[PDB]
Write a protein that binds this ligand. Structure first.
Ligand SMILES: CCCCCCCCCCCCCC(=O)OC[C@H](COP(=O)(O)OCC[N+](C)(C)C)OC(=O)CCCCCCCCCCCCC
Ligand SMILES: CCCCCCCCCCCCCC(=O)OC[C@H](COP(=O)(O)OCC[N+](C)(C)C)OC(=O)CCCCCCCCCCCCC
Ligand SMILES: CCCCCCCCCCCCCC(=O)OC[C@H](COP(=O)(O)OCC[N+](C)(C)C)OC(=O)CCCCCCCCCCCCC
Ligand SMILES: CCCCCCCCCCCCCC(=O)OC[C@H](COP(=O)(O)OCC[N+](C)(C)C)OC(=O)CCCCCCCCCCCCC
Ligand SMILES: CCCCCCCCCCCCCC(=O)OC[C@H](COP(=O)(O)OCC[N+](C)(C)C)OC(=O)CCCCCCCCCCCCC
Ligand SMILES: CCCCCCCCCCCCCC(=O)OC[C@H](COP(=O)(O)OCC[N+](C)(C)C)OC(=O)CCCCCCCCCCCCC
Ligand SMILES: CCCCCCCCCCCCCC(=O)OC[C@H](COP(=O)(O)OCC[N+](C)(C)C)OC(=O)CCCCCCCCCCCCC
Ligand SMILES: CCCCCCCCCCCCCC(=O)OC[C@H](COP(=O)(O)OCC[N+](C)(C)C)OC(=O)CCCCCCCCCCCCC
Ligand SMILES: CCCCCCCCCCCCCC(=O)OC[C@H](COP(=O)(O)OCC[N+](C)(C)C)OC(=O)CCCCCCCCCCCCC
Ligand SMILES: CCCCCCCCCCCCCC(=O)OC[C@H](COP(=O)(O)OCC[N+](C)(C)C)OC(=O)CCCCCCCCCCCCC
Ligand SMILES: C[C@H](CCC(=O)NCCC[N+](C)(C)C[C@H](O)CS(=O)(=O)O)[C@H]1CC[C@H]2[C@@H]3[C@H](O)C[C@@H]4C[C@H](O)CC[C@]4(C)[C@H]3C[C@H](O)[C@]12C
Ligand SMILES: C[C@H](CCC(=O)NCCC[N+](C)(C)C[C@H](O)CS(=O)(=O)O)[C@H]1CC[C@H]2[C@@H]3[C@H](O)C[C@@H]4C[C@H](O)CC[C@]4(C)[C@H]3C[C@H](O)[C@]12C
Ligand SMILES: C[C@H](CCC(=O)NCCC[N+](C)(C)C[C@H](O)CS(=O)(=O)O)[C@H]1CC[C@H]2[C@@H]3[C@H](O)C[C@@H]4C[C@H](O)CC[C@]4(C)[C@H]3C[C@H](O)[C@]12C
Ligand SMILES: C[C@H](CCC(=O)NCCC[N+](C)(C)C[C@H](O)CS(=O)(=O)O)[C@H]1CC[C@H]2[C@@H]3[C@H](O)C[C@@H]4C[C@H](O)CC[C@]4(C)[C@H]3C[C@H](O)[C@]12C
Ligand code: NA
Ligand code: NA
Lengths: 222, 222, 222, 222
């Protein structure tokens, strides 16, 4: 177009994205201030007005970005994320989910965008080890629920409660004073279940970490 | 044979192993559903029937696999594991040990098989460090049992209880509020035993991890 | 100058810096002894006299060092640190902040100076990951304060209290028995907030550590 | 000598060191059995006799080893350790220190000897970082003792008690529920002291570990 060139030369301009970055920061501090009961009584209307007069800017700039790249928008992870976080912020739990638009700042800022996509690119390698661990949790979740579910309903009564207690034991939070030692007052051989479980879960996780270290180092040694 | 070629051309076919994989998954979800008291009252007979009509399939397919490879079966770690997990599932604790046949899914799936055998191949290097640690635990288990066994019978009364408390201190779970600090109310110099113990156990474990990192990296730098 | 050469040939002499090192050590042991109520009653005056007759030496040697390097002093991180730790020790919380002049010993000793500046040079790389984590804490601090702030005021009532509880959960100290499990007595789905939070925070920190390992190894592989 | 060749050809023979290894193992199991009150009542005399008839063998074989290498013995770390652990076991706390002669098995066994000396060779590099950490603990031990020593005498009353509580906070055992959170009921800004302390102590330790990883990898990349 005649003006289509102008609008794609503003949408891809530095100052338009710098402006929506200042708005993300201002909204983030606004969102931060909205936890204060005293501030909300004193200036609640300026902030809620502000929150409206900023959600409108964000929605119009989503409209513009969609126009300049009609289908390129809906195949791009970052702009897709923007689409969804402005969608959440537009409906009349959702209240809390609205804060996620502050990750909008990870999208705009390129250095942050680089770090995030680096972290994502790590994941494909871990898929194989995660699958063994999820299967491993599934198997020991079922064993623990059938062994301790009656006498210890709060911790091992349900499969979900046993995926919870086992995750806590793997994080090694009160694994012994909190869970195993109380269990051994009724069932005196519970260590056979947990100390092996601990050992396996640690080993795998260690290897997971070492795996991440050689997949990173390969591109350097070449 | 005439049909022996047919049976070895089905046993090594893709679809026969895909079929026993679907059966492992169906049995795994069945086993998962058997923790629900409500589901077991409503559909317990369909599932127990299912569990029988699947343990039979698994046993016949073990029979077939043994026939096609008569001695190759009993020298192969994965099929040996299958032999034993279908054996456990065939006897009239065992109830819980039956769930282990879900690791049958690690055997069938090749990508999982790769990850598991990678994890195994790590272990030979750790044998030397594990032996020093097991000897180290043995020595400090005996010291702790003789020092605190009377006044603190629940934690250090027996060698096994002291291999337990020392493992908890090495995992650093309530090492200080839970065990050392109570001990210092009777025996005020217990830190000499534990803080050195902590230090040694951490150092060795750190080296263990670093060891795993150079044994992995060697095949890349070549 | 005529004597300016003499004073710059003492200020940069080995024995002048060896002397102020002995004074740092003597003051450090003095500072160590000043916690003892009994020693302070018995020899408090010798030590406070000593503390004065040493703060004067340190101040004159700051004066000398400033003279020999007039502007080189105020552009040098180590001597700048000396300026500020002798300033703190000169005013008529400050009492406790005075102990920081024992890090004066890191400045004088060159091997220590090397280690410290190595540790500093690591930091620039972590700036990108720290910024994502600080933003991530900010977002989940706000979510946690709005979700649990009323029913759990002590832990999540304020943004600062939620940056505190979330840091404790990331350190994995009583994350489950101490915070999540009590929360699930009122709000039974709190794991959705924390177990994801845990996962993200661990992953990032792991990568942070792996990052530090490849930035160190690069100068070796070249 | 005429027989001196014979005795140095037995002392350095495989079977003499294999024999004292069997004696270390037999004594280790004996020492293990001596925790059992029931076994000591039933067979206490056979074991104490055994313990004497083995401490004598060990002492004569120390005598022989000293003779074959008169001064080479007292300049060799492993045999020096043997000298001292047979000395401890010869005097008429010492009772518990006697168990250390089971590390005699690390000395005899060469693969174990290799692992141990590898672990030792790591340490020289950590000396610089350990010195910064020990100075760092000293400084924050003094700060914590002067800030919280009166209101919290059990944890921070003495410098030793503050080197204890700070070590526990660095191990991250009940750092927050156990120590900081109780402190903030009297002194509401204690996080300024501990969360910075935590951060520094973690960072340094991380670098310590990364250091160990590049000092190991250097001999491989060459
Ligand atoms: C990225 C990280 C940057 C740094 C983040 C800084 C976070 C600091 C938060 C700590 C503030 C809370 C401390 C405090 O005491 O403030 C009180 C209020 C809540 O208490 P309040 O509601 O005032 O008490 C009511 C009493 N009543 C019921 C009897 C009437 O609580 C507040 O006033 C909250 C104050 C809002 C702080 C917002 C700071 C935003 C930093 C900029 C980050 C932008 C990133 C895009
Ligand atoms: C930390 C704050 C998070 C905030 C919420 C985020 C929500 C999603 C936002 C997505 C924005 C980032 C997307 C992204 O960076 O993708 C790029 C990555 C890395 O690229 P990379 O792998 O380097 O590309 C090389 C491959 N090539 C050349 C053939 C194209 O390419 C890949 O994706 C590799 C494939 C692995 C994908 C695994 C992703 C899912 C893990 C977490 C799922 C959470 C669900 C709730
Ligand atoms: C590829 C990207 C990376 C993703 C990797 C993470 C995989 C996530 C695993 C979770 C999959 C299974 C989820 C699940 O089973 O949820 C069950 C429970 C819910 O408890 P629930 O029974 O609903 O409580 C209700 C109480 N009631 C009925 C009395 C009112 O909720 C829980 O307990 C979940 C606790 C977390 C357990 C994590 C277990 C496997 C993690 C493997 C980690 C891999 C790296 C090592
Ligand atoms: C590999 C990991 C994949 C993802 C795993 C998903 C795990 C999800 C488990 C969480 C389900 C439990 C939550 C829940 O509230 O369910 C209730 C039942 C047990 O309570 P219920 O017996 O219904 O209560 C009785 C009350 N009474 C005594 C008064 C009559 O508990 C149940 O109903 C259990 C529901 C069965 C879930 C099975 C999911 C299998 C996922 C597929 C994995 C296949 C791997 C090969
Ligand atoms: C090569 C493949 C890797 C394998 C490495 C793992 C080595 C496993 C070490 C276990 C060896 C010794 C086993 C043992 O001594 O068992 C004793 C206790 C049993 O307690 P017990 O006294 O039966 O309780 C009965 C209570 N009663 C009589 C009043 C009714 O049970 C326990 O306390 C065991 C607790 C675990 C302690 C682990 C100690 C050494 C681990 C070294 C780890 C190496 C990597 C760092
Ligand atoms: C770099 C690290 C080097 C090694 C650091 C060594 C730290 C050792 C500290 C442990 C000392 C405390 C143990 C102890 O029981 O001493 C008691 C005094 C405090 O109790 P006290 O005030 O005597 O009790 C009064 C009783 N009342 C109220 C009824 C009259 O507490 C004291 O007497 C404190 C003793 C001062 C020890 C100063 C050691 C400095 C080591 C040199 C480091 C120089 C680095 C530049
Ligand atoms: C580039 C060099 C490295 C630096 C990296 C570290 C970044 C430090 C993050 C701290 C920034 C935000 C500070 C902040 O928000 O302070 C709030 C609270 C204070 O609590 P407050 O509400 O004042 O308590 C008063 C109680 N009252 C009113 C009732 C009397 O105090 C806290 O809760 C702070 C707790 C620490 C939280 C740390 C959170 C982000 C850390 C990211 C770590 C990066 C590496 C993974
Ligand atoms: C290197 C690691 C190898 C594997 C280490 C194996 C450790 C196993 C230790 C667990 C044994 C303790 C379990 C148990 O219930 O035994 C009971 C006794 C102590 O109770 P007891 O004194 O029998 O009870 C008296 C009751 N009363 C007062 C009313 C009369 O406690 C005992 O009977 C202790 C049994 C001695 C076990 C010695 C095993 C040595 C393994 C070989 C290692 C050699 C390395 C050089
Ligand atoms: C784990 C069970 C322990 C049981 C108690 C042990 C008590 C002491 C037993 C001593 C036996 C081992 C002695 C030893 O292996 O020394 C050899 C190490 C490693 O040799 P390496 O550095 O490879 O030699 C190369 C240097 N070269 C070619 C120029 C000679 O050469 C070095 O020593 C390097 C120098 C660093 C020494 C740091 C040692 C002290 C750390 C722990 C102190 C604890 C005191 C209670
Ligand atoms: C080169 C080979 C590696 C060696 C590195 C390890 C360095 C060891 C540091 C210990 C140096 C200072 C020792 C010290 O100050 O001892 C004080 C306390 C003793 O408490 P105390 O006051 O005697 O309790 C008596 C109670 N009473 C009077 C009421 C009856 O005892 C404690 O609290 C000690 C707790 C351990 C603290 C460790 C602090 C610095 C560790 C730096 C670690 C470096 C790697 C990161
Ligand atoms: C990109 C990533 C790793 C790439 C790599 O490091 N090397 C591969 C290239 C050489 C890819 C390549 C192959 C992928 C696995 C399998 O396909 C399917 C498999 C099925 C299991 O039930 C659970 C998922 C499994 C383990 C997958 C995980 C992950 O998705 C892998 C490892
Ligand atoms: C394959 C594995 C490591 C291979 C490697 O990294 N380098 C070896 C090849 C060069 C092998 C090679 C040598 C093996 C040790 C000894 O034989 C026996 C020894 C007796 C002890 O009391 C306890 C077990 C010990 C430590 C064994 C551990 C482990 O089984 C080792 C390290
Ligand atoms: C020296 C350090 C890393 C050097 C490196 O490893 N490679 C860079 C050279 C190739 C430098 C180079 C680029 C720097 C970042 C950006 O400039 C600004 C950015 C803004 C964010 O909102 C928060 C800070 C960010 C992430 C900075 C972090 C840090 O300060 C970086 C990574
Ligand atoms: C062998 C070990 C490291 C070897 C290395 O990695 N590179 C050195 C060779 C190149 C050696 C070489 C130099 C040694 C330090 C200093 O001499 C004294 C110094 C005084 C402090 O107050 C406290 C101890 C310090 C930090 C020592 C630590 C350690 O003893 C070091 C690092
Ligand atoms: Na804990
Ligand atoms: Na912990």
């Amino acid at each position: 177009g005649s003006m289509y060139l102008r609008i794609t030369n503003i949408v891809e301009s530095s100052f338009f994205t710098k402006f929506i970055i200042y708005l993300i920061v201002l909204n983030g501090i606004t969102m931060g201030l909205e936890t204060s009961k005293t501030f909300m009584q004193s200036f609640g209307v300026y902030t809620t007005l502000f929150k409206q007069i900023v959600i409108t800017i964000f929605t119009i700039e989503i409209i513009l970005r969609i126009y300049v790249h009609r289908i390129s928008f809906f195949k791009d992870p970052w702009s897709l994320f923007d689409f969804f976080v402005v969608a959440i912020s537009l409906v009349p739990i959702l209240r809390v989910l609205r804060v996620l638009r502050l990750f909008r700042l990870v999208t705009a800022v390129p250095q942050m965008r680089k770090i995030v996509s680096a972290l994502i690119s790590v994941i494909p390698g871990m898929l194989s080890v995660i699958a063994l661990m999820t299967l491993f949790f599934y198997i020991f979740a079922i064993m623990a629920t059938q062994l301790f579910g009656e006498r210890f309903p709060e911790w091992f009564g349900t499969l979900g409660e046993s995926f919870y207690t086992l995750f806590q034991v793997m994080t090694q939070e009160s694994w012994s004073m909190g869970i195993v030692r109380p269990l051994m007052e009724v069932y005196p051989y519970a260590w056979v279940f947990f100390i092996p479980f601990i050992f396996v879960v640690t080993f795998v996780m260690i290897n997971l970490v070492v795996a991440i270290i050689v997949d990173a180092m390969a591109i350097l040694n070449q």
